Symmetry: C2
Subunit: 59 residues, 2 copies
Amino acid sequence: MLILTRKVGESINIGDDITITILGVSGQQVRIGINAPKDVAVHREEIYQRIQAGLTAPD
Amino acid sequence: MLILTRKVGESINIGDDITITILGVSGQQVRIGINAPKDVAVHREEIYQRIQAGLTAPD
RNA sequence: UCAGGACAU
RNA sequence: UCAGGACAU
């Protein structure tokens, strides 16, 4: 686990092929971006539960 | 490239072993959390430049 | 901004 | 906002 603080217009990184960018905020909402190869997956925590059910590609 | 707009307390996911959470905001600041194995790296964009200089894991 | 592989900025 | 593998929340 890691925790750190950032502000709009800055970035964070993961692995050696992933990047994250805080595009800005709108009230409690926070617009964020993600940059990774299609060799990996990325979704909301909601959609992730449909995938970790036992797969990475639908029927 | 992906873009999301979610608020404090929400979560997002990457790969099959990474998770992200938005702990909250303060004006323009945005405190964030990350959860991944030590088999991968995670730092802010500032520290990432010390790593991509020729490596991906500290001493 | 209700969910996408797009900064719509 | 100071930099860590910790929500210090």
